[PDB]
């Protein structure tokens, strides 16, 4: 009902961008949703680093003063995108603090040394299968998970998983209370995303993200948490990519399939 409310406006958005939209959007409080292409397998590019930080966050639960650990680095650790830790070098940084500049910075040197911590890809994905998420999938370290490669399922969720796992970590019981505060309290402070869901939400709804950008295939992403005021959070996905290498992603039509989404939950703004 509500998916076919949107379903011609989505695809000609797509058909002007030039590729794929996938989009899940989920209304918690009447659960009603909004969905397209939202089963098809996109590209995470940096979207996987939001998952890492809750990683952490619930390895933290049982493993008291985590957060607090310093971890030291070399020159070559330090690969492209790492404006935070390239900062730190000389000194090192926390756990807390990695994880921090790998949500609101998508620090790449951050992400890696985090991911070194749980196991490495597949240690992350066996946390996404302990929340119940089936469809997620990490395989390889930063840069080589942005190949972004047609057809390819590593590195990979769809937008519908996503969505339902951002809504157990951030909404639901899958982190400890004090945990999934300090997860939604990172996604609102990132400062990667201003140009795509957030472009689509209005000032005084608060707003938590985490954005991905592969650089090729033009794929790009961004979930988000919404809490528009006077009814219950809505939590949405928005993926895209491109059949030819050199396709260029565009964060106007992140934003725009947004807007269509939250248009089609019937959320005003
Ligand atoms: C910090 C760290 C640890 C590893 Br274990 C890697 C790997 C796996 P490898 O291909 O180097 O063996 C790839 C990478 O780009 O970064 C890393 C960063
Ligand atoms: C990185 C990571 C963190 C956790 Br918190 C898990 C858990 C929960 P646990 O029962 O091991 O304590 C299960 C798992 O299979 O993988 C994980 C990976
Ligand atoms: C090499 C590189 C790394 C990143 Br980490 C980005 C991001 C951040 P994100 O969207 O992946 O989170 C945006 C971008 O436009 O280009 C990038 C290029």
């Excluded at 979207?47 to 639960?61: E, I, M, N």
């Excluded at 900062?87 to 998508?106: F, I, N, P, R």
């Excluded at 890809?121 to 190949?147: C, K, Q, V, Y």
Aim: some cysteine; aromatic content about 8%.
């Amino acid at each position: 009902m509500l998916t076919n409310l949107v379903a011609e406006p989505f695809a000609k958005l797509e058909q002007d961008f030039g590729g794929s939209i996938g989009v899940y959007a989920m209304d918690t409080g009447s659960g009603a949703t909004v969905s397209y292409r939202a089963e098809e397998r996109f590209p995470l590019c940096s979207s996987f680093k939001g998952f890492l930080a809750a990683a952490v966050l619930a390895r933290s639960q049982q493993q008291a003063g985590l957060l607090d650990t310093p971890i030291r680095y070399g020159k070559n650790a330090l690969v492209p995108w790492s404006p935070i830790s390239e900062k730190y070098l000389t000194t090192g940084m926390t756990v807390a603090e990695l994880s921090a500049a790998a949500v609101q910075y998508s620090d790449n040197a951050a992400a890696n040394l985090l991911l070194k911590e749980l196991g490495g890809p597949a240690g992350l994905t066996a946390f996404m299968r302990s929340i119940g998420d089936t469809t997620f999938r990490l395989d390889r370290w930063e840069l080589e998970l942005n190949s972004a490669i047609p057809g390819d399922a590593r590195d990979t969720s769809s937008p519908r998983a996503v969505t339902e796992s951002l809504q157990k970590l951030t909404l639901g019981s899958a982190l400890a209370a004090p945990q999934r505060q300090q997860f939604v309290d990172w996604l609102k402070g990132n400062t990667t995303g201003n140009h795509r869901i957030r472009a689509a939400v209005p000032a005084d709804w608060a707003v938590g993200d985490k954005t991905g950008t592969c650089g090729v295939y033009g794929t790009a992403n961004d979930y988000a948490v919404v809490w528009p005021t006077g009814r219950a959070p809505i939590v949405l996905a928005v993926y895209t990519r491109a059949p030819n290498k050199d396709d260029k992603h565009s964060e106007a039509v992140i934003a725009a399939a947004a807007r269509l989404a939250l248009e089609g939950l019937g959320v005003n703004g």
